[model samples]
Target: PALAQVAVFPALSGQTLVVYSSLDEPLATPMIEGFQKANPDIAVHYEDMLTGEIYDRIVKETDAGKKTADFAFSSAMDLQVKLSNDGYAQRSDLAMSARWPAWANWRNTAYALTFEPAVFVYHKPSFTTEKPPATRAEFVDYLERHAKEVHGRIATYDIERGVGFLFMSRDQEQFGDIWSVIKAMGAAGVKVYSTSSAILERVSDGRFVLGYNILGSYAADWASRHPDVGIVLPKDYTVVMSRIGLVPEAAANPELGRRYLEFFMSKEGQTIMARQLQIPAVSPEVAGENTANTMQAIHGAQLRPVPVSPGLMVYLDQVKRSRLIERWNEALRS
Candidate 1:
């Protein structure tokens, strides 16, 4: 319910570009500054919200014939896909669209702008004798073997509340026997949270020895300040997701929204993303651990990017969503 706005290029023009996003201040600030620097004529008004809150606001506002956000961006790929699929998005004419990978753009409506992987963060001292698991299977084995040591000391996202976590959970399920791993985690008395910061903070303070399925960008950022915490990209496979962008069909400034999209996908914008924001830009041109090329070079064939397509909508289906959540609860409670 709290909205934060930054007025970039405040004196240059009166035309305010309103944006609704789930990206926090640290990541969104640089991108907004860069875009405003490039086009000083249009000022930007940005609002940060939870992914589900953004979705609900857009749908509700539009249904009431009220003007909604000119642009909506979030890491919740499935919700973004569902919004576009349900006809809430507007197609734009951006030149960069032709050059991006197929998976980055969906129906010319929703566009993936950054590539972030889900990762594992562990307390180094706890695993000093034995290396942390590099694969899900190995992770399961470790949980089973070290049940006594790791009991009630592991943390993960609660899939039911966070759309981002749900997206990753569904992808993990598709990639392997994620249920077994979830069962193991549940049996170990794993704590479930709705935010990465909470999980990372606890891991850093030694309250939790390990945190699973954490956003790599946030984990990397956290580990930089916390020496006790370490991060890993699972060697067997890592699920990559993007913070997607879309212009609402009923945007107050549709053209400005399109321009913002263009700026986000541009080489200059991606450079800021990689270097300044610490978000892994999907463009290979950007150089950093967050860039697509660096991650590909490191993970190679094991990197699995969840595409921004209809496949994301599988769990959004009411029946399927209910069934999957029911199964997940059963696994955890069993």
Candidate 2:
């Protein structure tokens, strides 16, 4: 089809926005639908992929001047920062500063779109009397006490990735050391999974009594459907990660892309994200009663951001990432 064919629709209807997101279907679909519904005249073409793929694709296209995406969104804010720091992203400080945290303010290139805490989930029917632990201490204590029963039933997300490592690093304070926790969990015969969604069914079916290092919202959504499954926001300060949004450096439709983000930051946009989409940003008003009620129940002070630097992970080096994972694997074996 001609750019004219697609261009004609946007020209006749209004601005058309193209978005590339590093978010899975169940989470990404509703947000796009909601944005389109709110701005009917403005057309949007969005595609979802994994964070790494999203980063590589955008970088490849932009570096070659292909400019395939008008906007980009990803859970891996770290990668987005790399683009900004490397001069691939143009500064949009005026619009971003007003909506995001000081920590999230990234040279006007990116802004966090949701608050996602790494959480633990469990199967309710597995235990007869005691509820699952809510804090790191309680969780460790429970594992110590129920070693036999808990063995082979614990699960953790792959700890070698970007957000995964951040969560593991944050957890080191309470666990003493992340490797020690990994070793202990392994000694108890814990299983390891590559993704959060992969562990949910095992949890719901009681195959695994406990799941570690999952996103709070993902766990909450699962629990809502499976009455016997439950999640806890670990009393230890939790790291709140956000799906990030950015306008490309040379977007074909920059103004439309900005308008799309404007809608996303608006009250109505957040409601759809929080309620139907389940990726709640700071906008509580956009959510339904269930989400709003749940938000009210939690103490706002309990949430905290994971400390991140634009070049922190890259500085650590991939060789280091591999070495850390190798060390972790070896430590667990012992």
Candidate 3:
């Protein structure tokens, strides 16, 4: 119960929209409050749950014939797309759908609402003489050259977990030679974790020299407050993954769900996301600081956003997963 919290917000009207979201309860106040102010008539029944739990809640509730969450959202963009692909969500035909980035909208069934990149978070003080490796090529070379210096100082996820596999899938496709990066880290005694914060903690505390494929949201959060933490959106190609949203197919109040999404994708809603929540806004309307527009303007084509399309469904196969997992092991083995 403590891990997942639920709260009720009755705005100007009684009719409510139920949202199952992955973000913590306290962090969502601005996004929800901002929307309620715009469309004051609608109330909100917000449930804060993990990504996998959100997936199960929607599918199980929908399959059982009781309408599920009116709106579904998660940081695991792939999980949200999977729900839509599995028929748990419906076409939204949103006003902003056409305006959304190519990689953020999928057949109008799902949409990426926030822009978060997979970045590198390194111990700032450790690299006093030289900058931390900024590209994959230099990353490989750094690991090999400093193999013994950072024997156990490099970290990412354990690779068997869902999040790790998601990043690895992108790594395999986006970079020219990802295997060498893996092997180099393995030889340097790379560490692994189940959460991004864990890797960030190690990096900030000087326990780890660097963290690979770190979530931008968490990395930025830590770096903002921790002097020891430094973040980089890789020079070669920065991988961007976003928190997505969709209207549930069995939404009790389907119209309310669409209205909720409308505000979220609007200028005001995303402005709150960028300025207040500090999460990167996907909408170009908010050219404000921390918005994806500025980040894109600065990085341009080097920032590669993961497409919300069904192409990510390929990661579901156990055979492919296990083989990839084994390859990770082979790369890590002493």
Candidate 4:
């Protein structure tokens, strides 16, 4: 219930850009520093909160006719798009806007900022005898083959949770018969949690043998920290989700917000993002193992980045979201 601690990194240039985002303060510091380093005259006012808070505060502030943050960013895809769809977000038309990929731009309003994929993260030692599951069908087979060995040692995202809901919905949409995969994990006594870290921690420590459908951005952090950790994106199809970044229509300085997004799209910031922050890059100007431009070279057809479209609004429908979770609960219960 504590308020997000706001941070102000003052620079000589008296102008401070305001940003409300889902990125943790510590995790976001590198980019903030890089941004300030490049634009030494400008300062940064940053606020960190849950994905829901970012959406709510922007909406409430704008609804009250008050100027909100100059920039807004979140992993909650549907909510961000809703902001763009409802006119809460303004069209950027920035330097890099025209260069962004088709799937990464939404009418030049909401833009996808990264190419993070949902992946299978597993304990290495547990699979020393055989290779890890690399596709959804193999995942179900692996779970069933080792049902007793894996019972109570498998976990996934709680479908009721936002990121969890998004990933699971994508799973159903991309991999059609995903429910059977859920049923298989259920038969092995799978567990569910709201955060990737919760499931990933258990998998890393060997308390849990595997965590399916974890956002790889988080998974990548642990895979490096824990020798026991290994990641696999299903070969048949990998679902990639992006963090949406936008300028609010009620922003005191929409240009400043648009400038920040451009910095994000710039090679310098995108490098810090892909290399330092450990989040994949969406910028075409950046070239690195972590950039979407690079990964597509190898996993082209397999990599399916959710397109930027009004269709994302489907996830926001309460009835559809509720029914989907209901189906998830039913599949996991037995």
Which candidate achieves the best lDDT against the true structure? 4
Candidates sorted on TM-score, descending: 1, 4, 3, 2
Candidate 2 vs candidate 3: the lDDT winner is 3
lDDT of each: 0.81, 0.68, 0.82, 0.85
TM-scores of all candidate predictions against the true structure: 0.89, 0.80, 0.83, 0.89
Which pairs clash (backbone N, Cα, C closer than 3 Å) in model 3? none
lDDT of 4 by residue, 161-235 (tens): 556777888778777799899999889899998678888889998999888988888888778778898899889
Candidate 1 matches the true fold with a TM-score of: 0.89
Name every residue pair that clashes in candidate 4: 13-41
TM-score, cand. 3: 0.83
Q: Which of 2 and 4 is the better model by lDDT?
A: 4
Residue 129 error for model 2, in Å? 2.4
Ranking by lDDT: 4, 3, 1, 2
Evaluated against the true structure, the overall lDDT of model 4 is 0.85
Q: Kindly give the stretch of ten consecutive residues in candidate 3 with the minimal lDDT sum.
A: 309-318
Per-residue error (Å), model 2, residue 112: 1.2
Question: What lDDT does candidate 4 reach at residue 218?
Answer: 80
